[PDB]
Symmetry: D3
Subunit: 311 residues, 6 copies
């Protein structure tokens, strides 16, 4: 009969869960009377966040979701599409990528989703998102892969399968029902839309996620080598023929420098396209990123640009 996504959706929905968060946050004591004609400017306030997650490990009962949903939580509950409810405890979170991991207490008869290798994605691929944009429940929508933050190096998937005025729900799945990414919120504190959706790709979700299980957090790889700004003592001494950039004096730490095929003298000025002005420009950009990252540095020395792997 008629083509439909219902068939695969019925095999995927059991892996998608609903998350009810109850948390408290420190807030300013309201100053009054309230005068709506004035530009003005501590107590605990209870809040209720809500969102979606995907079951990533059925035996352990690990569930990936968004940090903007589970942040400051005090009690978190989970409901499977069948109706069953469980308690869950937090296991790790990451404000930068807006990814967080939770663990179901007493997991039983759970179905984990199969994760696809995101490195295989291509722009015109079809995608469907599964989330909760208005708090009314699990809503599913479809579209295609609009942009790839690499294939088309610390990527991001842009998809037109994203709901207007809604909160970046949960799962981004392909036609075979496999997880290709988790939809996130770029404008964090505000689960919100920019007009198109962004998602961490599944491989990154997997990497980010194994780290939270192993360390309670994702280890930041802030790692240059030990260099000296351009125009300084040991820096100016050399080339300076096509100057303007971030100089690199040493490389011995052997931190993806004896691996980056980088040695003394170099002068990096790129990090996936954006020109690396200063030297600290580098120290910062390359340090706020998640271990295992694959960023690329356009290096100067008359031909040189390799890809790094954090750690």
């Amino acid at each position: 009969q008629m083509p439909s996504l219902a068939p695969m959706l019925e095999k995927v929905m059991p892996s998608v869960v609903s998350i009810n968060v109850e948390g408290s946050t420190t807030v300013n004591t309201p100053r009054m009377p309230r005068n709506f004609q004035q530009f003005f400017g501590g107590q605990q306030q209870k809040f209720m966040a809500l969102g979606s997650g995907v079951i990533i490990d059925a035996d352990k009962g690990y569930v990936v979701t968004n940090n903007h949903v589970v942040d400051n939580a005090t009690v978190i509950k989970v409901q499977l599409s069948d109706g069953r409810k469980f308690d869950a405890k937090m296991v790790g979170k990451d404000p930068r990528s807006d990814i967080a991991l939770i663990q179901i207490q007493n997991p039983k008869n759970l179905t984990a989703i199969k994760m696809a290798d995101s490195d295989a994605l291509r722009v015109g691929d079809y995608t469907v998102a599964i989330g909760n944009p208005f708090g009314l429940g699990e809503t599913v929508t479809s579209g295609i892969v609009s942009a790839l933050g690499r294939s088309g190096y610390e990527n991001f998937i842009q998809t037109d399968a994203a709901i207007n005025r809604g909160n970046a729900g949960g799962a981004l799945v392909n036609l075979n029902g496999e997880l290709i990414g988790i939809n996130t919120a770029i404008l964090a504190p505000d689960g919100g839309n920019i007009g198109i959706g962004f998602a961490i790709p599944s491989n990154m979700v997997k990497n980010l996620t194994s780290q939270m299980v192993e360390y309670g957090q994702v280890k930041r790889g802030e790692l240059g080598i030990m260099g000296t700004e351009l125009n300084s003592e040991l820096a100016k001494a050399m080339k300076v023929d096509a100057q303007r950039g971030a100089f690199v004096s040493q490389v011995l730490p052997n931190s993806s420098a004896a691996k980056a095929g980088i040695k003394a003298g170099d002068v990096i000025t790129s990090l996936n396209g954006k020109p690396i002005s200063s030297f600290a420009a580098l120290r910062a950009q390359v340090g706020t990123m998640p271990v295992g990252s694959k960023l690329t540095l356009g290096l100067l020395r008359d031909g040189k640009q390799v890809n790094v792997n954090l750690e």
Copy 2:
């Protein structure tokens, strides 16, 4: 050659009509001069509404549309996709579901749409909407069934096939060209979008619609039985072991109570999920609904929850 919806659209469009409403409304006499720096605060004012409808009965020439389009109308006109124009008179309207019925005067060579049984819908099904979001004409758009207010009990279809910033047009149709619902406006007085579209499902449209033909209106089923609040004389007397809710003293009226499998003593506290706090909470929620409704009541008495059918 290439896949297209044009083929089925050409078999459906003849059933979709354009509605031009001319009406008058009572308005406040403007107070002036107008000072845009002030927060301030009767005559008849002519207005022009516009919208879409679907031909539901070709011999009778019955056309379903939205109450926010035909409300306060004084003259209503209809244009078929072929160009022909007819006059129409109102036959019934319903602000709650935003559905209204009109009748074409001198119907001739009309094509009614075939209505599908909406109980068969499933979330990943494909849908296409046909309406007039900007007043520029008949615009068609497609997507899928994002949520079902029951299948996934007084449902609602949520579809991502809904235009941004537009007025909830008319028809919601499936791939075989059959009516699966009429797109409505939840924010009534303002044909508007919340970010995703809602539609009354076809079966409800059919029920709602037969009622307007038969009574000029949809009969409200406000029908409990005759009970007595919880904690009162005849209520407190019993159980009160797992209290907190709406008590039910009698059931003899035999109004889906001798049918709800409900008898004296009970204590209902649900109506499709939302906890029934008070007793009037019940009297109100279950009374504003359209006859024939299928709502469900989570009843307390240590195991009891049946589905009702208004009347």
Copy 3:
């Protein structure tokens, strides 16, 4: 030397006090994540209100202030212009006129202000207001009496001595340092300005205030007589020559009816200018007012309009 208000201000300021309110209020539990692109929609929340008051009785330590400052208070503190602080307990409040009365605990060496008879005010009289518009402290400002809600019958003083974008402070005083009114907030919940200031005149403040001491509240005088709508049985029977209004059948209750010089048959259609359309129009307008009121009723019977005194 140079003219100044400082001289009289130094004799008045000791009567003007600062009020620090600490209160709790029931609020909605924040729903999140917060999406600033959505139109959405219980716990106790502590708040801090702030305002001004005037010492009206030094022995008893009675202080008049605004109900929008002391509403929902749990702890109220008072600081005299000299620095001394006292605790105060609430004694009465009135949302309608925005007036409230508080009592200082352990009053000692207090100076009450002298109240002037407001019936003597005239439009071009000079006035000075003393309050706290931004929370920064006691700010004084001057101007004149811009309008009188009677002299120029349940008056109101309009004064151009009112601060832009500020909260209607406290006292309105004349050139001899006497209280002529308390500045209030017409837009209650929002201590705010409309562009000019309003104040309850001192005589009303005095009346309103004696009532809160005597009853914990100001007694509402909802008192017609016992009549019967116009066009009804006993109403239509009579005149109806210059109809259109509120009929009056009886008067025996002797409630400012045997005092209003009103008797059976009458047909009132005025209440200080505004035409009294219906009969309940009267029942409502004349019932929300504070006892002792002096409202006027343009009565129909070919010449008749007297002034009433509630109770």
Copy 4:
């Protein structure tokens, strides 16, 4: 006793009247449903304007007011401060200066105000305004002369005696109760405040007003002489030593040119300060002004600047 303005106000108020306008205007037929998420885009609509006026001629019953109050009026009513009401017919209006003149029908026992010579005003002089900023009635406020559009040549009086967020009321009067100007609305269509008030000075009001009685309108004095742009045939031929401006070829029309002490050759480039760029710049600025104007032209010819008097 205490200083007050009440004394003089009681001698002035009888000259200040209240104006109730009932008018109709051509408006767009509302297009619906109304979607508040859309940027969109004829019938007669009745409106009610309201404002203040001053009695300028008691025998004739001439009343000056604002054109933004009486524009498009169909019925105009007038109430004296004593309560009496009269009908009035329009006699002239002027959108440019926002001044209009009306005539009372059956004037009787009227008191006209005495007009002061505005040429005598000085910045620190005291002023009081009398108007109706919120529609609540006659409100009076005071302040000083903040700026003079000449004394400090087609002046304007700026006064801090102007109400926040209100509609530029009516009269501007000095301490002896004499009219020194009518407060106007610079932002016409919106009786509104810029933060300080503007008023046509009394002498201009008098001139503007005598013209409306005599012609139904104020005659525009668009009058150069007949010249030829700078850089043209007969223009470039001469000087051009300190060029850049508006050339003047002829002067024979004898229109304040044989009076402006202006003759062939000249090159005007000023009109009360603002540099006269082009030649039409002059034709326009000097033509939209009211006859009898006293504008000044900084003329070039190595020393030349005289003041003109329209006509």
Copy 5:
């Protein structure tokens, strides 16, 4: 395996290019201090526009894009999806249809897109748009043909394949990878969305584009014949039986009048639906359009309506 658009996208992307514009514009000199509480009111300012284009002629290196992207450009650069960059010079632009043409300097190994005949489009056809809505790069999205400004006479394609809050990108392509239209911006100065996308159809793009190559501009066809308004001398003389419209006296110019099958006497009152009120109404509407246009005129003379072809 799974259906995808990636396959055809890989054959199309090479034809889609990125355009970086650097231009200067005349702007007002900022007046300060900036007071955000005031409604206020020349130098050159450099700006940077950005957008998309499609390679329409590989040998010549002609690239079509939007006039709102290339307007006021001083330097324009182009990057092919492979990374190569070229300089380009402007060749023609058209604010009305928002289409502009540029030429690549030193074109080499370029792939032009194949253009489809837009006259063949039908509403349910599938479409995909390729553009740059946020400046982040080339983003592709899909949907269907929602409306046709003719097929369903100076058409426009409306497509739901348009990104929310983004700038109308570039190309609109069908499933075989052929250009069916260029997405434009109706709200010009603001690359922006109305909620659905508009595009000039490919045939018009082709016509508009050949004109800019041949004349530096698209020649406007402002061409009636030479008639005389309705009710005038030679107009009223005739019929006037079903009057109300634009009269047509002559036709001899032979400008699609000896071609429009139009002769003396006629009275046109239509231009693709919209009633032609006045005679200049016609002169204007039919003159702002692009040569080669196919507009239709509902002509009066008891049966007459032909389609014109500009020139």
Copy 6:
């Protein structure tokens, strides 16, 4: 005759000058097309600021004004109320108090204003402000001293003589024509009103101003003594009986510590009322202030609070 301020204003205005600033500032290169539905995110841009100043030294030609008027200036011009214009060069500025000093080039026949001792001001004193709120020129307004940041210790004068929606003009003068303060802008970058005006008092203006002449800037007095936080090694060792505050270990620097009557052990927790929480809380608050300041510290040691004088 009638009271007026004109008399004294004529003796003061010659000291008040008009300042025309022409400056350049570094700004972001506009990114386009401009999409008003997007939340987005270097070149020199010329600006024109405008404001008022007061002649403080006639021989030297020193003029005080606001830093928000003269900041980033490249050319500054000055016009005396008589018409004469001079060039001026900057001599010092201070963003904190918004005061700046300029010097007239070729001063000649200048009249300096006489400065009054601001320590003598009292709340009900009369004041008049002279400035340029809309750019239209010199506007004068009057009112009274509403609040004193000390008399009623690093004061501020609050005056109701401040124009709505305008830029804090220049001079604040008393009835004898003497400077009592310069009106400033608290919301700096935006010459703007909060609803009432603030002014640096004349004595501070004098102190601030002598410093800019002597050092090009006002020397910041960041000066504690050298102490050690509360709860630390040498701090906890002592008292701690009524703890909670900023400890003070040493005092030997003799910086208003051997002058503050302060010695080892102390524990300051006040700075003119506001409780000094931390120790750095002190280091910061007392360091951003202008030398010569008179701030007061509520010191703990069972009775101790003296006033300091920076340096």
